[PDB]
Amino acid sequence: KIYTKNGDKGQTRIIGKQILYKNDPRVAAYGEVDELNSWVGYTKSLINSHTQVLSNELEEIQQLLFDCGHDLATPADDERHSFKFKQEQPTVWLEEKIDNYTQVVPAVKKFILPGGTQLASALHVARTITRRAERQIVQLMREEQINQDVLIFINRLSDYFFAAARYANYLEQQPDMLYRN
Amino acid sequence: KIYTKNGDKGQTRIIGKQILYKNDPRVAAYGEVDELNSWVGYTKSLINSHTQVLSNELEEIQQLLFDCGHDLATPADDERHSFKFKQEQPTVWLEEKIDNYTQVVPAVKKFILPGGTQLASALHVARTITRRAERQIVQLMREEQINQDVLIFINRLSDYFFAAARYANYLEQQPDMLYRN
């Protein structure tokens, strides 16, 4: 059975033997990353012929977020369990994409508001959910030692979603939504 | 008029006469369940011919979540108002569905990542929003006496969404997304 009922009184296991309340900042950080992952899965379900080029990298992002969640669930001083996530190559990978997408899209002009195509709009939602997860990761960091690589990546990731959102609009010839002064 | 403006200074009524700030953990718990309910409504709007079998139980879940919200809004020591939600039959009902859906879907293999069809992806989002509500319910529980039946149900409910998500993928012959080691 997938249900143990062990969590019925509001406590849960993390990586290692530690049992925490589900409102613990560590469990919250893990959960926000999990919710982001689910949103990314939802976003990739909206891909069409015009935007198929985005499918692979979204899948890779889900893989990377699973690793982020693992590390958030891992106490830094746990002898038996260690961090698995390293920021350097995934973050440089994001930066390459941010750079590429930023140059191909039209120069603006005004501040950009979230929206456009359904996919671009979803990528904008991904941006804001990433930022929500980031806040909770910072909450955890202020109480416990974390894998700081996760925070670097999650910071960069919301810029990725912004750039990818603009690019998704561009791919369907949809103008970005702009703030009118 | 649906607006009283009574809430314009950030306070609000619960069940009974009590007035709380909108950031009170009780109001937050109620609100997270309400947001879950809205997400379930959104999810059921995505049902197609292949997945029509899921419509009725999602509607029943919305009914049950309304009852959960009521009880979260009810102080335990309120003489005039009492809990209405009982976990036993709804939770056994969920468990029956979890069991059925778990056996019909393919055995894996790897850890499952959220995604697949738009409906399955939405059900995965429902899973994570349920867990977010659960954390806030636990926050409330740590400060105030709650209807513990609500927590049992909400715990089980996220397993329901996981199982139903896999089942929704299965119903459209879509493989579950898997974590690559």
Add this chain to the structure above:
Amino acid sequence: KIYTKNGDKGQTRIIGKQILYKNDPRVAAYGEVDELNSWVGYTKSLINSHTQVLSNELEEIQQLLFDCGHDLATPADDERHSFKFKQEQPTVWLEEKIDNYTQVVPAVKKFILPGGTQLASALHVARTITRRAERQIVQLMREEQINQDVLIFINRLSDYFFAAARYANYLEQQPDMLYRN
């Protein structure tokens, strides 16, 4: 480049020179409004021929939310920077719409559950995300002086989404979902 990396250690700038941790209630309030804005962009991407009448006002709401976010990011005692958002005309504008939509839709009957058409369901999600942002705005208010006009507007805005959701259902001849006693 859109990424400075200045935020990689979990701190960020607001309006003016102040640097805050990303989990600061002010940054959280700003972020929740931003997430609402993205959800509104997503919602407006779902508009069809039957509901095109809702497009313009949703766009105006995104403009207004950008102004709300600005003011939430502005300390009240900052000499160099001031509040830009005034509630009176936008809120009266919402109230006019709430009144109109409330009278055209069928009288009920039972408590309304969120759902119906995909757009109506999305507008119901907008309602709950607005309320989530409202809670965080109240959290900030309890620690710092805020532009209280933002809170008035955000309070009213969730009633707008409720009314607009019902109206969106009505526009496609879809009955509201009702709670069965």
